[PDB]
């Protein structure tokens, strides 16, 4: 069994050695007003890991649009990271522009609970989504044998940033929720007086005093988020292996 | 500042009280050859949680077709669970056919690391995907303010089952991987002799001795996986709040 | 076994979440010059608990006359508390006006020793009677299977406030004591000189130097206390189940 | 700062010295197939305590008829116990037929949590109701300044024996509950399947699937319990101090 | 076994509850320049203990002339103490004028090692002779079955007070020592130089350098002490049980 | 500070070295059906200690009549014991016939609590009265400055053996008790049934059910006990310092 | 085993009770510029111990001439010490002029490791040779059965004082060493340079760079030490038992 930092906590204060140099987490991103997604992979020159790095690199523009930086993590050293990045550029034609943490003694990995029973020595496929205040907002642990759906990582940061700016909770499968579609949920009342006040308001569509929603998201916000999902659902036009 | 069970561990032995009665995890499901998705929600009669239960309930037959059972969890008691289910059936027209664990002293929540800094008293939106051997395969921690993408939970269980069956690793964004499309990855060589023998046998398409793949997934398996992501990407024709 | 606060101790300082808001105990009631009865029930949408909530609600005016506020407690959450109150108002015609604490991790339950061996997860039927100084004056532990006699809780607070205001101890079964009727007892001498001064004085009816009494309670005080017990002994005029 | 034994626990094994001899609790009463009420008082030759011993002795036949015995407890020694009983018989005309525990080192007091903050040295007015299996069923803690309502101890024991024999829970204020009067509650369903089958049985009057009741108590058992509360409510015809 | 305070130690600082009120030991006596005898008995309304209280009461003036107060101790409460004193004055015609400590939790009993193996719950017949500086000078432990010789307690305090004021040690059986009669012992030399100087002074009757004595006690001092032993030896003219 | 063994406990098993040889306590005396008085003195060739050794020696026949052996104790060695015994025989004309324990490391002294605050290195004037079963019956602690009353030690053993043989308790100042003279007390009733049975038989003189006595002692028992006290009270015929 | 103070350590600070009064070691002797020989014996009025005391007493002037005081030690008390000195003066005709420590709880014994397996209760024949700075210079432990050679104790202090004043080491059997006779050894070089600088000087007789000596002791110094050994070797002309 293992130990983790938690949703709602500040990302633990640490210096990390990356292939772009030493950076301090979370302060390096906080000071820039930037969210970051820190993710891990078992080892360099591994095939599922390579496909994830290519997926992330291809979506890099979508992340920069949301004010989100990316940072990778494996127990491999900076030299392996750089040779691996060179290999991907040369054989796949995709430059990886974001840093990768070298975690040789698994100092960062043990702090983030990235070592699971599947490997004593290599991190699983962890994801920490950290907001511009350096707070952990979402944590995912995918295994060695299964690649992530990177479009879901985009949907999560887009939905979270929306939730924060409009003061709303996001329904299941947004923006295609099967009850309220692209509707966003008003935080429910926490007192009986508040409940009564809302159900006399008439200000929101309601199924009950605890279930109110409106549609305050721009058409652009809704279609941006839906575009992530359509990309994930779409059979690719040209497979990159053909031209490699 | 919390501790979780880990991918590759057995789901911890525990007797739990559900609105369907008392069961032993993971035995109850192992003895049936079933996988199970244990997920949690903060409290009954909450709006994001309600949208997630309807979402799971609409996908119930998809889960059942894969041999996956569902079981929810909150700190609310069985009588609340049943009253909440009655409300959903009555007001939304959707029956919740799967059990919900009652965890009032947070005994299960603490074992599974479901209590994060966002609330000392209520569980975040955890997901534990457990195979028919009772082994944790994947763990997701979504926060109070953000509903899950239930189609990604279907893609995860479908891809892991395919990977176990076909002895393959699954590329990022499968079945729409940008490098190899619906291709599955051969576990890479672990020795130099194996590396040489792989590259000499010419038995698979390859970018290097560590990156080989084939297309062994049935057309039905691929299309079922694409169907989950197409549903995720499409706005439903009619929203359930309209006939509510 | 387990642990409890004790008669004569200050109610433990604690912030609690109720369906009326967050309040500090006992400060919230001290600061209003009010006694409070804190009571617990196992779970929302339980029948004995429902009968007790209705009994307390019917007696709300009687507690208000004594400057006593009511606060309930169960491990269920506030949304369950509010839905349960709405069910009682709709189906029995009785509005519950007093707050209910939500104690999902049993934090308040353990502090007040409300978790007995009958249930690891749900509180028994505890009663804490607390005066306007925040001092615990009386504690009752009724089990899952037995509802409380709420008229005895009225008699307890009425007789305690009478004792406080007249400097008197209250005999068994007051105001219908089989020795002295509605009489109240003078605190006995604690020294041989006090015992002699008392037997020389002739100020009180006495059976001995340690058993003196008088009748300093108003007929209003006596008859109000007797009314509580006559209501407990009275077959009700119309059963609330009929009116539904 | 105190530690109590708990409802549902076996009364703790102990040898006690009484003014009737040495006995083992709860074995002495279990062996006779008896329930017992253990109750405490601060000291011999105290006036509220005397009024309570007289109340219990007056009700002794009522306890005996229920298969219930009484045992007292203070920190005073056996010779003081016998002198006090003699004083009560001589001066009030009432024989105390049941034993009193002598607990001079507070060993029994500390085991049962009978030392509260009102007195470091002297027991409050504790009540332990123990069944014929030796299991604690109810616990009451009255203070120094307030006598018990002994008719409520009779109602507690009668209602418990009825609930145990009829497999029913007992409503608030039974047998005068304002919702169902002298009706007794069917323990609610613990599963959705039990809840459907119960609603579909039409076997019982119901307000909901979790609130069902019938009237299986004999007229005699109901009238026995109403008798206790009528005695509590009525001013005695003559007071024992008058003929003293 | 068990522990005790020791000769030469200060009587331990403690607040005690007596039938005359609350007092601090040893300060209450120290502040008056009075010695005290603290003594204990197992329980009120015991026959040997009654004989000893009557013996002490008969000797009260004799103690008073030495500037020695008396204070008793049992584990019974002050109300038992006062009832017992009343019984002695009524039935034996003797008033007990000195306080008795009430020690119901054995707090004082455990501090002074008065709980011996004869009873786990009741003090043996302890005696603590404490001077006006609050220092324990002598300790006696009589058992349950054997009354004290109170005249020996007077001889101890008289002999100690003479030893103190005349700077002398007191021989065996003083004032009727078989070797030197009413003589008192010069404390022996502690050096060879002191030993030679004592023997070269011829100031004292001596049997050796270590055994010197004189007769510095007044005739009044010696006769007071002979009177205590005379009274112990002579049968009383009139037994008190005659006119019961 | 300070620990001791206790009345009612077996004298602690120990081998001691005496000026008569090595002996096991208490087995050496138990084996012969003898009681023993163990007493201590600070040091050999001390004046008060010398007077007490002569007092005990003069009373040796009186101890032997009762079946009681004497054994002394100090921290001085065997050779010093024998040289001190010789000095007493030579200078006072009195043989000391009983053994003295040598306790140079304070092994026996620490076990019996004979090291009080008056001296860290020398034993106070302890007295342990041990019966033929090896049970400690009475313990006295006299200080450095005050010699014992040896006649009181005879009266204690006599009165104890009499209590044991006649199944009686011994009143204060026996056999010159101011209430009942040479009467011995019947151990009081411990139950109400025994108290009633006693007060009915009229078998004894009674002041109450707890205070019964008779006069079962032989005139020899009474007069031998009084003779010890008359000896304590009598001015000696000729002082032993005279013939020296 | 056991535990000692060591050569080169300061003698442990302690206040000891002697037959000359209380003194502080080593301060009492350091403050006078005097060495001291502390020596132990098992018990007073033992024959080997007596012979050793007479041997020291005969050599008292030889010790004084060196500025060496003597002090004995047994577990016996000061009164025994003084009586034993009286016996020696009267029966042997020898005065013991030096103090003896009284150590009845073995406090000093345990500190100086004087309690060996030969006796748990009495010291062996310890010798502590302490210089005028309070430093332990030599330690001898003779057993119960073997008296010391007191002339070797004189030889040790004389040779140490010569070594100290002349900056020399003392050869085996000095002043009759078989290699260098009354020669004293120059402390050897501790470095290569010093070794060379020694052999380059003709300053001293040498067998090697590490074995240099001269004859710096005065004839009187040598003759003093020879006289101690000549006394050791010679049978005394008159044995003290004869004129005793
Ligand atoms: C090439 C490389 O990754 C690397 C990184 C850190 C090192 C630290 C110490 C020594 C060699 C290293 C090589
Ligand atoms: C109705 C309900 O949720 C429930 C669940 C568990 C319980 C355990 C003990 C007592 C009452 C309970 C009620
Ligand atoms: C609706 C409800 O009972 C409730 C109360 C408190 C909560 C705190 C955090 C998250 C959800 C909550 C739901
Ligand atoms: C009758 C009474 O109070 C009593 C009971 C037991 C005892 C045991 C030992 C000594 C005295 C006792 C007195
Ligand atoms: C008079 C008496 O024994 C007494 C002493 C202390 C008490 C403390 C609390 C309650 C009653 C008490 C009675
Ligand atoms: C003479 C004396 O007191 C004595 C007694 C016993 C001993 C045992 C061991 C060593 C010395 C002893 C001296
Ligand atoms: C006479 C003697 O050696 C001696 C030594 C020390 C003492 C300490 C306390 C009491 C008496 C003592 C006698």
Swiss-Prot record, chains A, B, C, D, E, F, G:
Q: Which reaction does it catalyse?
A: a hydroperoxide + [thioredoxin]-dithiol = an alcohol + [thioredoxin]-disulfide + H2O
Single biological process term from Gene Ontology: cellular response to hydrogen peroxide
Domain Thioredoxin, first and last residues per copy: 5-162
Q: Does the keyword Oxidoreductase apply?
A: yes
Q: Which residues bind substrate?
A: 125
**What is the first-listed, main subcellular location in coarse terms?**
cytoplasm
Q: Has UniProt tagged this entry with the keyword Disulfide bond? A: yes
Show the active-site residues: 49 (cysteine sulfenic acid (-soh) intermediate)
Any GO CC annotation of this UniProt entry:
cytosol
State the SUPFAM superfamilies in the record: Thioredoxin-like
As recorded in UniProt, its EC number(s) are 1.11.1.24
Q: Where in the cell is it found?
A: Cytoplasm
Q: What else is known?
A: The active site is a conserved redox-active cysteine residue, the peroxidatic cysteine (C(P)), which makes the nucleophilic attack on the peroxide substrate. The peroxide oxidizes the C(P)-SH to cysteine sulfenic acid (C(P)-SOH), which then reacts with another cysteine residue, the resolving cysteine (C(R)), to form a disulfide bridge. The disulfide is subsequently reduced by an appropriate electron donor to complete the catalytic cycle.
What protein does this entry describe? Peroxiredoxin
Q: Which organism is it from?
A: Aeropyrum pernix (strain ATCC 700893 / DSM 11879 / JCM 9820 / NBRC 100138 / K1)
Q: List the top taxonomic levels of the source.
A: Archaea, Thermoproteota, Thermoprotei, Desulfurococcales, Desulfurococcaceae
């Amino acid at each position: 069994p293992g130990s983790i930092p938690l949703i709602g906590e500040r990302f633990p204060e640490m210096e990390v050695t990356t292939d772009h140099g030493v950076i301090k987490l979370p302060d390096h991103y906080v000071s820039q007003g930037k969210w970051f997604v820190l993710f891990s992979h078992p080892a360099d020159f591994t095939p599922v890991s390579t496909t994830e790095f290519v997926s992330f690199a291809r979506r890099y523009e979508d992340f920069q649009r949301l004010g989100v930086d990316l940072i990778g993590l494996s127990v491999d050293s900076v030299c392996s990271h750089i040779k691996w990045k060179e290999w991907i550029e040369r054989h796949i034609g995709v430059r990886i522009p974001f840093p990768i943490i070298a975690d040789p003694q698994g100092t960062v990995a043990r702090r983030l609970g990235l070592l699971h029973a599947e490997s004593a020595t290599h991190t699983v496929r962890g994801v920490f989504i950290v907001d511009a205040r350096g707070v952990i907002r979402t944590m995912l642990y995918y295994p060695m044998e299964l690649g992530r759906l990177v479009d879901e990582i985009l949907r999560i940061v887009k939905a979270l940033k929306l939730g924060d700016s409009l003061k709303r909770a996001v329904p299941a499968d947004w923006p295609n929720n099967e009850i309220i579609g692209e509707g966003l949920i008003v935080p429910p009342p926490t007192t009986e007086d508040q409940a009564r006040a809302r159900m006399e308001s008439g200000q929101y569509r309601s199924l009950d005093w605890w279930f109110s929603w409106d549609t305050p998201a721009s058409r652009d916000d809704v279609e941006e988020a839906r575009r992530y999902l359509r990309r994930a659902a779409e059979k690719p036009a040209k497979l990159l292996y053909e031209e490699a």
